[PDB]
Design a protein around this ligand. Structure first.
Ligand SMILES: [Mg+2]
Ligand SMILES: [Zn+2]
Ligand SMILES: [Zn+2]
Length: 1269
DNA sequence: GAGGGTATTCGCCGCCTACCTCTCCTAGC
DNA sequence: GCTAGTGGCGGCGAATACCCTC
RNA sequence: CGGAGAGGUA
């Protein structure tokens, strides 16, 4: 189509290659297994590197050397024969090998299912025997001629059989006469009875040998006749002697062969139309296992019939040879070559082919030629796919060689290693340290790394400023780091954004852009407020630096990716660039009121006025400086630049407003005034202690009510203040600060008494081992709880450890109890708790037998963490692949469908109680219908963001359920619409028209997978994986399918649950339910004669998603999956909005399984996209309506990912070989419409700024501005 | 003998990202 | 220096090997 | 800088 490659690509088509195509690609034949000569280091003629085939190895030079100049361009030498051109041609030209005998392609013979087996209806064992010269096969037979000749051959064989058996009978009669002669011989004298019996035994055993000879000969002839009369094509005849007799006796009437030539002949004499008709007939009739087999056979046969591709491409008469530059051979230090693996395999193929050709030409017996053909077959199989059949062809070191099929597969294959990822220029790396002085949009960049990244710009500026005369002088000056380059570098790097990235890149904010500023040193200075987004600490981490070059790239880095523009988490909307650790401690210390402190407010005592009231915060600061006042002492202050709270403002000023400069008396501490002076001017005064949650709420309010620049400046100011006041907060660690509970011994003795009583009861006969273990795990659990409570009560409120934990900065109280109380219960290699506790704390020091088990547990945890981090990445990759083409495409589909969210179900006594999980279900959603209460007017209009004010108004009005728009019900053909998706969690506004929401959903789901532990029902990451893979749950719990009463039965190892429907049409029963599982409690436990719902879950466990779809419908399975995943994630304390899970679940429900094909071309049991199915049915009903009937189906992420319309995307994901062979057989054409495909071919992705409406903007000055010039 | 089921059994596919340092590379005539 | 060649495990689907009547 | 192996960092 487009020759080598030229822009305006339209499609990428694949198919089977014929021998004619292979010989057309070829520039010449390879017929010598010689790579390079050692005496001259030049390619050998007709070898794997021959220059007459693959082109010159030097620019405009010939092998002989007659022409060695650019003038002799395009002329083929008359002596050497190598065309004079550039040396890059060796990367493009291919050769070929002319095989002496036909060979099969291993992909279409050995790959399960064997496609040759389906095409020819031969079992894989028959193909194994025939292909590798182990059994003959009948290729043809002449029926009419053989029948007409049989009409006489029957009599002829009868005649010869009669002749043979009559000769045998004559021989036996002669033997009888000889027996009579022997009788006379032994009767001539006095013989022995035993001697008579011995001679009789000899005679009769010879006679029986004759009888057995007759029987065996007749069996041979009868078998030959039976084989011939019912002989048919595609029959294997082992026992070469039988086939030899068949051909000798009946040379004509048929043709038998062996090897790949026989398969080629069979494919030649094979009409596809008749086979397809027979398969379709067997499908429409018959039913059963035959129909099941015919379905697959027809799949392959229709694949070969619909297209204009012949099936004769499975047998190869020639082998292409890859260009030399793609399989180079290098030389080790000294001059010894390290040959590649491809060269060795090509060499073996060439050797075997040449020797086979020699034997064939010279003449040889059948056996040797067949052996050589088999070895050639095996050599070509090893070349194409090494190790698929038989032992791998190994090289030195007993390691299997690489094949052509290993260059495309795996984590190190072509796709995932070279096309989906690359190594790039203008990039560096070093260690990261902390720069507190930076701002949220700045980073410190080492001078030596900046000089190298910005080398061309510095050279250009050096030439411009007359420091060098040409570019070479400037380049040398930069290489030598002369003192004149730093001054120009300072100005060159000004306002040039730089991208920073830290691996692993779990979510979007792992890459962010900053404004570089040169620093002294070799480590990068990172802002403290981006560590959470990067997940970076400063114990040795390293980061990578990338430099955008073009104007568009700089614009993207400066607008889309700037660090100060990404404050909120895209997964949940919570702020990520907010104070933590030291900053939280400092702010918590500052904004704390300690009763009875210095300079505290004092009411009038009847002899002096009130004490502790100040006329301004400046006076309070002066008093604090003098040491008369404390920053944490309650006072009365007059404030004029701080806005009063809502209550004070309403009851003090009214209507008009605060109008900065109005004085009001505040009753707070000085630290709170200092904290409130760090917030925007119009923000109401906050009088509270700043726990981390209070700060998070403040930041969320600022983000949702102010522009992001104000938020960035506010977080910078809070960082400064927190770091300043954490130094003066007086938090340290000393063994005097680690207080021990004052009565640990008493509690331990009290519970040891209980343990002793239980142990003695066990010693007596009252309870078995398990009861004792459970009782001892209890008692000790309560002892640990009581010790923790005593420890908490003992500690003062201002202890550094208590302050750090309670401030929300970091840590929890379990660690505090372990450090100062007692560790408690440990776990056995199976996970169960040991009945013996660890009564020592790390302040006292564990003993040697309490340390051994502790180390056991710690190492077990570390290993589990490693396995979990390995397991989460695979799920993230699958999630990304399944939903990579879900992109916002419209603004509104104007659909009337939606979903209902509970939104604070009501109380029984009568009251509205807010649903706990409301921010991940109801917020950031658009209304689908107007909300009305008790026939009143609408409370919230259709198409409302439905934020906090809207939800509060809805709750006040007394309405619980509201219908909202969801992607599950979006009507857009491709992608989704902005209104259905709703608010963007990162931005806080309606999502844009180019936003790629599938990748965001995948990254949001997959990122918190390590926190979510991998803990007979699955309960963690395995549970999530089985939910997303649509597998059978494991502990499957049956669900009813028709409302009615139940006749529960009680028994051992089985329960009989019978559904007696209200209609009574039929009764369903479940009898295999093992007694291990309990019975679910719904509405009291399930009991006999109890009415149940249609979708009720009878037992206790996890219901499979496939039954709920078959019984209740798609919406029910959607809500089921969303609820299950959300609960699995909530159990660990992770908040993800439901829209991401909805995106994934939408991607999982997109196809329908066919039942009746009708006039349509869809085969039964095929998965067809719902839109395509509906379009085909609507087209068909117009003309001779015979519409197909289909049913909804649920597919896992892997199946939905591998059932794509692009063979390139599917091959770059998994199972490259199977996908490629199927695509080649079906002759699939790839329309390059997708993110991964455009990434592979190096084109602008169809999302974001690469969309047509954005990339085609036209810019021009206004007429007035143009005139003003 | 001949349709209807098997009914395990075996083979193939999958198993996180980024970086740094160092040693060795065929046997026989 | 040159020439030749008996320490992974789960999930899924096709395939033999096996009756089971019939 | 082609391949194999060993060790280490986050
Ligand atoms: Mg670290
Ligand atoms: Zn020449
Ligand atoms: Zn929509």
């Amino acid at each position: 189509g487009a020759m080598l490659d030229v822009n305006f690509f339209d499609e990428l088509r694949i198919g089977l290659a014929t021998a004619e195509d292979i010989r057309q690609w070829s520039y010449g034949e390879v017929k010598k297994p010689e790579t390079i000569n050692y005496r001259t280091l030049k390619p050998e003629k007709d070898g794997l590197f021959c220059e007459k085939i693959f082109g010159p190895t030097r620019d405009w030079e010939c092998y002989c050397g007659k022409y060695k100049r650019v003038r002799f361009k395009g002329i083929i030498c008359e002596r050497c024969g190598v065309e004079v051109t550039r040396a890059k041609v060796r990367r493009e030209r291919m050769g070929h090998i002319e095989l002496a005998a036909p060979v099969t392609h291993i992909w279409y013979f050995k790959g399960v299912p064997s496609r040759l087996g389906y095409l020819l209806d031969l079992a894989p064992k028959d193909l194994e025997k025939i292909i590798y010269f182990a059994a003959y096969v009948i290729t043809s037979v002449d029926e009419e001629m053989r029948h007409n000749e049989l009409s006489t051959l029957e009599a002829e064989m009868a005649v010869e059989r009669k002749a043979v058996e009559d000769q045998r009978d004559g021989e036996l009669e002669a033997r009888a006469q000889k027996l009579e002669a022997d009788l006379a011989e032994l009767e001539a004298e006095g013989a022995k009875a035993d001697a008579r019996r011995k001679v009789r035994d000899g005679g009769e055993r010879e006679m029986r040998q004759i009888r057995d000879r007759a029987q065996r000969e007749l069996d041979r002839l009868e078998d030959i006749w039976s084989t011939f009369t019912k002989l048919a094509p595609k029959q294997l005849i082992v026992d070469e002697n039988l086939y030899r007799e068949l051909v000798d006796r009946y040379g004509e009437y048929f043709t038998g062969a062996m090897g790949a030539e026989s398969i080629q002949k069979l494919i030649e004499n094979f009409d596809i139309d008749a086979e397809a008709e027979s398969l379709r007939d067997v499908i429409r009739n018959g039913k059963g296992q035959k129909k099941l087999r015919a379905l697959k056979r027809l799949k392959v046969v229709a694949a070969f019939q619909q297209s204009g591709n012949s099936p004769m491409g499975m047998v190869l008469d020639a082998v292409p040879v890859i260009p030399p530059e793609l399989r180079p051979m290098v030389q080790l230090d000294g001059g010894r070559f390290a040959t590649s693996d491809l060269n060795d395999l090509y060499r073996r193929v060439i050797n075997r082919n040449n020797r086979l050709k020699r034997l064939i030409d010279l003449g040889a017996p059948e056996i040797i030629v067949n052996n050589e053909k088999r070895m050639l077959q095996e050599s070509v199989d090893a070349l194409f796919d090494n190790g698929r059949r038989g032992r791998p062809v190994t090289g030195p070191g007993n390691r299997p060689l690489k094949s052509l099929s290993d260059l495309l597969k795996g984590k190190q294959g072509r796709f995932r290693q070279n096309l989906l990822g690359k190594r790039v220029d203008y990039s560096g790396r070093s260690v990261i340290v902390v720069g507190p002085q930076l701002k949220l949009h700045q980073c410190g960049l080492p001078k030596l790394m900046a000089l190298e990244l910005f080398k061309p710009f510095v050279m250009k500026r050096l030439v411009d400023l007359n420091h060098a005369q040409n570019i070479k002088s400037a380049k040398r000056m930069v290489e030598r780091q002369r003192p004149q380059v730093w001054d120009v570098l300072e100005e060159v790097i000004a306002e040039h954004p730089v991208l920073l990235n830290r691996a692993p890149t779990l979510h979007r904010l792992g890459i962010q852009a900053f404004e570089p500023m040169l620093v002294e040193g070799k480590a990068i200075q990172l802002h403290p407020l981006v560590c959470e987004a990067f997940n970076a600490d400063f114990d040795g981490d390293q980061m990578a630096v990338h430099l955008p070059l073009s104007a568009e790239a700089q614009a993207e880095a400066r607008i889309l990716m700037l660090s100060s523009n990404n404050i909120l988490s895209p997964a949940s909307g919570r702020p990520l660039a907010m104070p933590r650790l030291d900053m939280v401690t400092g702010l918590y210390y500052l904004t704390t009121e300690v009763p009875g402190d210095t300079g505290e407010y004092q009411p009038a005592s009847g002899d002096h006025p009130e004490t502790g009231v100040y006329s301004s915060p400046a006076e309070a600061i002066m008093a604090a400086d003098r040491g008369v006042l404390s920053v944490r002492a309650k006072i009365k202050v007059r404030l004029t630049q701080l806005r009063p709270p809502v209550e004070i403002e309403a009851e003090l000023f009214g209507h008009s407003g605060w109008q900065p400069g109005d004085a009001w008396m505040a009753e707070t501490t000085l630290g709170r005034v200092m904290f409130n002076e760090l917030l925007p001017l119009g923000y109401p005064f906050v009088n509270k202690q700043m726990h981390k949650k209070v700060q998070a709420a403040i930041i969320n309010d600022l983000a949702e009510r102010y522009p992001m620049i104000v938020v960035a400046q506010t977080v910078d100011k809070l960082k400064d203040a927190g770091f300043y006041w954490a130094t003066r907060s007086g938090v340290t660690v000393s063994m005097a600060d680690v207080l021990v509970p004052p009565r640990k011994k008493e509690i331990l003795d009290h519970y040891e008494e209980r343990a002793d009583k239980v142990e003695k009861q066990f010693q007596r006969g009252a309870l078995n081992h398990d009861e004792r273990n459970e009782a001892l795990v209890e008692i000790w659990k309560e002892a640990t709880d009581e010790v923790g409570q005593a420890l908490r009560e003992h500690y003062p409120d201002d202890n550094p450890i208590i302050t750090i934990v309670d401030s929300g900065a970091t840590g929890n109280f379990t660690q505090t109890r372990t450090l100062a109380g007692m560790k408690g219960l440990v776990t056995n290699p199976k996970g169960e708790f040991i009945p013996r506790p660890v009564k020592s704390s790390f302040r006292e020091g564990l003993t040697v037998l309490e340390y051994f088990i502790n180390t056991h547990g710690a190492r077990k945890g570390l290993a589990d963490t490693a396995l979990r981090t390995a397991d989460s990445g695979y799920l993230t990759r699958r999630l990304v692949d399944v939903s990579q083409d879900v992109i916002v495409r419209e603004h509104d589909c104007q659909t009337e469908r939606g979903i209902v969210v509970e939104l604070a179900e009501r109380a029984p006594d009568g009251t509205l109680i807010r649903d706990p999980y409301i921010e991940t279900s109801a917020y950031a959603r658009t209304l689908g219908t107007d909300a009305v209460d008790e026939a009143g007017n609408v409370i919230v209009e259709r198409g409302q963001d439905l934020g906090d004010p809207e939800i509060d108004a809805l709750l006040a009005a007394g309405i619980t359920q509201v219908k909202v728009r969801s992607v599950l019900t979006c009507a857009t053909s491709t992608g989704v619409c902005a209104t259905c998706y709703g608010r963007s969690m990162a931005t806080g506004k309606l999502v844009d028209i180019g936003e790629a929401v599938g990748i965001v959903a995948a990254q949001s789901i997959g990122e918190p997978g390590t926190q979510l532990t991998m803990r007979d029902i699955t309960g963690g990451l395995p549970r999530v994986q089985e939910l997303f893979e649509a597998r059978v749950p494991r502990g499957k719990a049956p669900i009813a399918d028709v409302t009615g009463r139940v006749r529960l039965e009680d028994g051992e190892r089985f329960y009989k649950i019978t559904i007696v429907p209200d209609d009574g049409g039929e009764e369903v029963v479940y009898d295999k339910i093992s007694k291990r599982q309990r019975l679910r409690v719904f509405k009291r436990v399930l009991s006999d004669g109890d009415h149940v719902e249609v979708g009720q879950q009878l037992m206790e466990g996890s219901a499979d998603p496939h039954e709920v779809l078959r019984v209740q419908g798609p919406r029910e399975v959607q809500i089921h999956l969303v609820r299950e995943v959300q609960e699995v994630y909530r159990a660990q304390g992770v908040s993800i909005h439901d829209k991401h899970i909805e995106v994934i679940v939408r991607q999982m429900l997109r196809r329908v399984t066919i039942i009746d094909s009708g006039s349509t071309e869809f085969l039964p049991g095929s998965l067809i996209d719902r839109a395509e199915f509906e379009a085909e049915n609507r087209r068909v009903v117009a003309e001779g309506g015979e519409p197909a009937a289909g049913r909804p189906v649920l597919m896992g992420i892997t199946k939905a990912s591998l059932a794509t319309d692009s063979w390139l995307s599917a091959a770059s994901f998994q199972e490259t070989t199977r996908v490629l062979t199927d695509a080649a057989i079906n002759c699939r054409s790839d329309k390059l419409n997708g993110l991964k495909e455009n990434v592979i071919i190096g084109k602008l992705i169809p999302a974001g700024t690469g969309i047509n409406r954005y990339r085609n903007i036209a810019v021009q000055p206004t007429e007035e501005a143009r005139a003003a010039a």
